[PDB]
Amino acid sequence: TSCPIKINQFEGHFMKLQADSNYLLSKEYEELKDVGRNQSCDIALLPENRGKNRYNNILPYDATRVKLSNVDDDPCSDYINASYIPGNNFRREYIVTQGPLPGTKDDFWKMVWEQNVHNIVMVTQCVEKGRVKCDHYWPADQDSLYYGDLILQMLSESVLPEWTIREFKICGAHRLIRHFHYTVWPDHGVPETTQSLIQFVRTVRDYINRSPGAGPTVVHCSAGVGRTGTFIALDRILQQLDSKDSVDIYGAVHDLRLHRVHMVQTECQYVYLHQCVRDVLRARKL
Ligand SMILES: [Cl-]
Ligand SMILES: [Cl-]
């Protein structure tokens, strides 16, 4: 369930993994294949919930799903496609979810309100080369909108070359929510540089560390598994490097997989995590 590498050995460890056409890397990534796989997704499968899943084969485990509150009238009114995920420090440091659908964006905001979320991380565009990935579930401008019993107002939007940071006020109290939208992930494969995602993660983590009251950080892409799991794994491992004498990429991904299917969905993303750590450690060493 873990594979901790001493920082001074990490360079050579990763070269070793990469030798003979990623021979041993592939072997290790495959060891993760089965983690979590005993767990059912019965609630997600109930007829009343079918329209609430973006992908009919990417569903939260019963044991770790986030539940919406309910009172009077409440079939599976408690359902959203979202899972609690541990971080470097505590259980439920994140909530991972699918890209909201037009028909579940009210549920999404209800969850953000009920869970005291102050930071949302989005690692997809809404449409990628014409394929719908996520509904545009926030306001397009500063004009307010209702989502269910909540009112949302976008107070600010700061567009940078690789991500956009929005701030919303939500009234249900009123709270300030920041949205960190990474806008450059390639349509296929991982980002072209490690620096891009490293700098994005570092920026998000700065803000999270400035939100001590908050509930979990929401992270999503389209399905809430591959890019999302890579983002969370990188956030967790970068914190390891700052605190610790070793780094456990395998262990972070193992832990993510115990909580949601497919977290870090491709070997390419698993390689990218190693290349990110390799690059940070090279710069430190120097
Ligand atoms: Cl749920
Ligand atoms: Cl960790």
Backbone dihedral angles phi then psi of residue 52, each to the nearest 5 degrees: -100, -5
What's the 37 CA to ligand 1 centre distance in angstroms?
18
Any binding-site annotation on 187?
yes
- Please calculate the CA angle 168-171-176 and round it to the nearest 5 degrees: 35
What's the 221 CA to ligand 2 centre distance in angstroms?
21
Expressed in angstroms, the distance from the first to the final Cα of the chain is 32
* CATH code that applies to domain 1-286: 3.90.190.10
* DSSP code string of 242-262: HH-SEE-HHHHHHHHHHHSTT
Cα 79 from Cα 52, distance rounded (Å) = 8
For residue 190, give Cα distances in angstroms to 68, 149, 227, 231: 33, 38, 8, 11
Q: One of 171, 221, 268, 276 is an active-site residue; which one?
A: 221
What's the 171 CA to ligand 1 centre distance in angstroms?
23
Active site residue 221: yes
What's the 184 CA to ligand 2 centre distance in angstroms?
26
Q: Which ligand is nearest to the CA of 93?
A: 2
Cα 239 from Cα 93, distance rounded (Å) = 13
Which of these, 41, 81, 78, lies nearest to 63 by C-alpha position?
41
Q: Which ligand is nearest to the CA of 252?
A: 2
Cα 273 from Cα 194, distance rounded (Å) = 8
Residue 257 near residue 35 (C-beta atoms within 8 A): yes
SS3 content of the chain, % helix, strand, coil (to 5): 40, 20, 40
Measured in angstroms, the resolution is 1.9
For residue 63, give Cα distances in angstroms to 3, 41, 101, 255: 25, 8, 23, 14
Q: Which ligand is nearest to the CA of 95?
A: 1
After which residues are there C–N gaps above 2.5 Å in the chain? 172
Token pair in block for residue 141? 């401008």
Any binding-site annotation on 12?
no
What is the chain's alpha carbon radius of gyration, rounded to the nearest angstrom? 19
What's the 53 CA to ligand 2 centre distance in angstroms?
29
Q: Using CA atoms of 43, 44, 45, 47 in order, give the dihedral in degrees to the nearest 10.
A: 80
Residue 85 near residue 96 (C-beta atoms within 8 A): yes
Annotate 155-181 with b (16+ C-beta within 10 A) or e (fewer).
eebeeeebbebbebebebeebebbbbb
Q: Solved how?
A: X-ray
Any binding-site annotation on 269?
no
Token pair in block for residue 201? 């993660």
Cα 54 from Cα 196, distance rounded (Å) = 28
Q: Would you kindly state where each structural domain of the chain is located, as residue ranges?
A: 1-286
Residue 43 near residue 65 (C-beta atoms within 8 A): yes
Cα 285 from Cα 91, distance rounded (Å) = 32
